[PDB]
Amino acid sequence: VPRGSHMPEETQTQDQPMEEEEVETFAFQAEIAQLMSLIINTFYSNKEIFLRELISNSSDALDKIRYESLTDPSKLDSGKELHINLIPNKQDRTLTIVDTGIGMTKADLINNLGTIARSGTKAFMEALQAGADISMIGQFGVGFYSAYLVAEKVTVITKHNDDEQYAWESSAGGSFTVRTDTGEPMGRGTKVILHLKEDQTEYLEERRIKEIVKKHSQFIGYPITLFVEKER
Numbered sequence: 001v002p003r004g005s006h007m008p009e010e011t012q013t014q015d016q017p018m019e020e021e022e023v024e025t026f027a028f029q030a031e032i033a034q035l036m037s038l039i040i041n042t043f044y045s046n047k048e049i050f051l052r053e054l055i056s057n058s059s060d061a062l063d064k065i066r067y068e069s070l071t072d073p074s075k076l077d078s079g080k081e082l083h084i085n086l087i088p089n090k091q092d093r094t095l096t097i098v099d100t101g102i103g104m105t106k107a108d109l110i111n112n113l114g115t116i117a118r119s120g121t122k123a124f125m126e127a128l129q130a131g132a133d134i135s136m137i138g139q140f141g142v143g144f145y146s147a148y149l150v151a152e153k154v155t156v157i158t159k160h161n162d163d164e165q166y167a168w169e170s171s172a173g174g175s176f177t178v179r180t181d182t183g184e185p186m187g188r189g190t191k192v193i194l195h196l197k198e199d200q201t202e203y204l205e206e207r208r209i210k211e212i213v214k215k216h217s218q219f220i221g222y223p224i225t226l227f228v229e230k231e232r
């Protein structure tokens, strides 16, 4: 039956097979759960230092590239720049910290981002009770959780040369999940996506982001770049 022209909907290609993502759910180590509750539900005056904490994690992951080269020169062949990108999305109310560091395996997410007790956790909670500044968090080993000063939910997408791409996610409440991520490949590195709380939207503003980077993170050691969406 002759055709001279087809509608879009007719030549619509059949979907790729549905992907299966394996998901697992884990409880946070008891004292990590306690700290996340404390961080979430207490007022702190200097919440901006969350960005100094995640930038530091990124910087540490990038320093690992340079040293891992000494025992695996393969990585010198990568053409990827060692850098950090800050991506506020006013539309979705997210701030995303992206790096091209070494990334995390599945077991690294499960162990490093919640299941293994940290020996400073108790001491830091005591310090906060006794009125320490929240800024001291990173010296107690638990600075990743400062994300929950500003974020109601945090998703971490990551890819390590030794594993497949995974997503960790938690809205606190005592648990997190790790799942395989068959979504947009990142190549190598980690993206931390902060879903900001309703009253913490100043961290999507480019001036505010520039201010806190200048104040707290001016020895990162790698280029940091802020992507600003053009105002329509």
Ligand SMILES: Nc1ncnc2c1ncn2[C@@H]1O[C@@H]2COP(=O)(O)O[C@H]2[C@H]1O
Pocket (backbone or CB within 6 Å): 057, 058, 061, 099, 101, 102, 103, 104, 112, 113, 141, 144, 189, 190
């Ligand atoms: N951007 C990142 N890249 C690689 N690993 C990270 C990143 N963010 C957090 N982590 C891991 O999570 C850990 C949290 O505690 P640490 O800073 O001691 O060590 C950190 C890393 O192991």
